[PDB]
Write a protein that binds this ligand. Structure first.
Ligand SMILES: Nc1ncnc2c1ncn2[C@@H]1O[C@H](COP(=O)(O)O)[C@@H](OP(=O)(O)O)[C@H]1O
Ligand SMILES: Nc1ncnc2c1ncn2[C@@H]1O[C@H](COP(=O)(O)O)[C@@H](OP(=O)(O)O)[C@H]1O
Lengths: 271, 268
C-alpha cells in the first residue's frame, strides 16, 4: 500500500460495527459464502470468526469494533461466527448492539450437515464412536439422541424461533448451501440484493476445479490468482447405513417443512 | 495461496502471448487503465512494462513469453508499453506475432500530454529549461521535440493501419478515464470481448489527490490510489504558448477524430 492510499484510509476510513453478520449454520457453507462475498468492492470482513456474542462478550463492544476492518463510505462491514445461531444469549446481544443488524444463515440438508459435522469432529478426535452409534439414544427403538450437537444444530425451525423473538423475519436471509455449490453466481445474486449491494459477482468470477469437485474463485479478493477452499472444506464423508439415513431424514422432515413455511421457501431436502 | 489452489494453476495453467496490448500513449493514462482492468477476473497482466517490441526485441520471443503470467482458459493475457505507439518497427513486429492482436491506445489532449511529459522529465532532471523554451525552434514550433511529436496521433496511426485493420484498435479517452472511469472501462471490456463486470462501484474519488482510486485493487482487500508519480503537479504555462500549441495540433486532431470516428473533445 502506497502513501496516498494509506493516507486516504487514515483520513476518510473508519471502523464500523458490522451491519450484517453470517450467524450460522455450522458446516452450512459459511466459509464459501464469505469468501465469495469478499470479491465485491463494497464488502469488507473480519478474517477470523470473532466469537464475540458467544465467547468473548465480556470484552465489550469497543473490543469488537476494534477487530473490524477500516472501511470507506458505502462499504459493508461483516463477520461470520457459525456458532451464534445456537447461542442462547446471541439474539439478545446482537439486538442490543443494533436492532437493525442484518442476519444471514447458510442452511444445508440437516442430514448431510450432521454427517459433515461428525466428519469434522472425527478428524479432530479419531477415536470417537461411529456416526450410527452417536445418532441413537436407542437404536432398535429408533430413538434418536437430540441432545447430541450434530443432530441438534440441524433443527433450524426451533433455533429460528429464538431469533424471531428479537429480529423481524425481513432482516434475515436464508441461503441455500446446496445451490451455493451448484450455482454460486445465482445464490450470490440474492445475497447482494439483501445487503443492498449492486449485483457485481457473476458467473465469470468462478472456475470449476474438477480435481476438487467444487467451484473456485477465478480471482480471489486481494489476489490475482484463483482460490479454491482448502482441504478442510469439502471433506469426504464416510458411508452411512442406509437405514440410519432413512431414520434421520424421517426425524428432520417435520421440522424441515416447518422451516420451509417460516422462511417462505422449499429448500428441497425432502423432494 | 494454498496447496489445492497452487496445484490447479500448475496443472491447468499456462503462459500465453498477449492477445491484447496497451501500446500507448506516453502519459495518456496507461497505468490507470491497466490497474483498473486488472480488477476483472478474466484479465491477467504482466506487472512491468516489457518494452519487447521496441527496446529488448533482440532478446528473442522466448524472453517475452517468459514474462507472461500463467493464465486459465478464458483469461486474457496483457501487457502495456506506452512507447510502442511511436516505435516505427512495432506495427510489423506485433503483426508478425499475430495479425489478430487487439490494440488499445489511451489518448490525451496533445497539449496536456506534452506538458505532462515535460513535467516527468523535469522530475528526473530539475535543471532542464522551461517548457516554453523547449516548445519553440524559433513562432516556429520545434516539432522535432519528442514531447510534441508524440502528440501527433494521426501520423502515428497511419503507420499502424498499414499492418492492422482499424477495428482491431480501440482509442480510450484519457480525460474520460478520469471523469468517468466505469464509462471508459465499459468500452474496453466490450472491445476485449469480456463480460462487463467493472462498474461504478469499483471506484472511489479521492478528494485530496484529485483522482479516482480503486475501492478494492486486484492485489488487495483495501482501496488503492495511484502513486505520487501519477498525477504530478504541472508548472504554470504561458497562455500564448498554450494557444499556439493548441492551434498547431487542431488540424491533426480533427483528422484523428475522422480516422477513429470519435471526437475526443480537445478542441470542443
Ligand atoms: N466452493 C466450495 N468449496 C468447498 N466447500 C464448499 C464450497 N461451497 C460449499 N462448500 C461446503 O462448505 C462446507 C463447509 O461449511 P463451513 O465453511 O460453514 O464449515 C463443506 O462441507 P463438507 O466438508 O462436508 O463437504 C462443503 O460442502
Ligand atoms: N486515477 C488516476 N490517478 C492518477 N493519475 C491518473 C488517473 N487516471 C488518469 N491519470 C493520469 O495518468 C497520467 C499518467 O499516464 P501514464 O500512466 O500513461 O504515464 C497522469 O498524468 P499527470 O501526472 O500529468 O497528471 C494523470 O493525469
Amino acid at each position: 500500500p502506497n502513501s496516498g492510499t494509506l493516507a486516504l484510509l487514515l483520513d476518510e476510513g473508519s471502523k464500523q460495527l458490522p451491519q450484517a453478520i453470517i450467524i450460522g449454520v455450522k458446516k452450512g457453507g459459511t466459509r464459501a459464502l464469505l469468501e465469495f462475498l469478499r470479491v465485491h468492492p463494497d464488502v469488507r470482513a473480519v478474517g477470523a470468526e470473532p466469537h464475540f456474542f458467544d465467547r468473548s462478550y465480556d470484552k465489550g463492544l469497543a473490543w469488537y469494533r476494534d477487530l473490524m476492518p477500516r472501511t470507506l463510505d458505502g462499504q459493508i462491514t461483516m463477520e461470520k461466527t457459525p456458532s451464534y445461531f445456537v447461542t442462547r444469549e446471541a439474539p439478545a446481544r446482537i439486538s442490543a448492539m443494533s436492532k437493525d443488524t442484518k442476519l444471514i444463515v447458510v442452511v444445508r440438508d440437516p442430514v448431510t450437515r450432521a454427517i459433515s459435522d461428525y466428519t469434522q469432529t472425527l478428524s479432530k478426535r479419531p477415536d470417537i464412536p461411529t456416526f450410527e452409534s452417536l445418532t441413537f439414544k436407542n437404536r432398535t427403538a429408533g430413538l434418536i439422541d437430540t441432545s447430541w450437537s450434530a443432530i441438534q444444530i440441524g433443527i433450524y425451525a426451533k433455533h429460528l424461533e429464538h431469533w424471531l423473538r428479537h429480529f423481524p423475519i425481513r432482516q434475515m436471509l436464508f441461503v441455500s448451501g446446496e445451490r451455493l455449490i451448484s450455482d454460486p453466481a445465482g445464490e450470490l445474486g440474492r445475497v447482494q440484493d439483501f445487503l443492498g449491494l449492486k449485483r457485481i459477482i457473476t458467473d465469470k468470477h468462478f472456475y470449476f476445479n474438477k480435481t476438487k469437485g467444487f467451484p473456485c474463485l477465478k480471482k480471489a479478493e486481494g489476489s490475482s490468482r484463483p482460490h479454491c477452499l482448502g482441504k478442510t472444506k469439502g471433506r469426504t464423508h464416510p458411508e452411512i447405513d442406509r437405514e440410519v439415513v432413512r431414520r434421520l431424514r424421517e426425524f428432520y422432515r417435520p421440522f424441515n417443512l416447518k422451516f420451509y413455511q417460516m422462511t417462505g421457501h422449499d429448500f428441497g431436502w425432502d423432494g
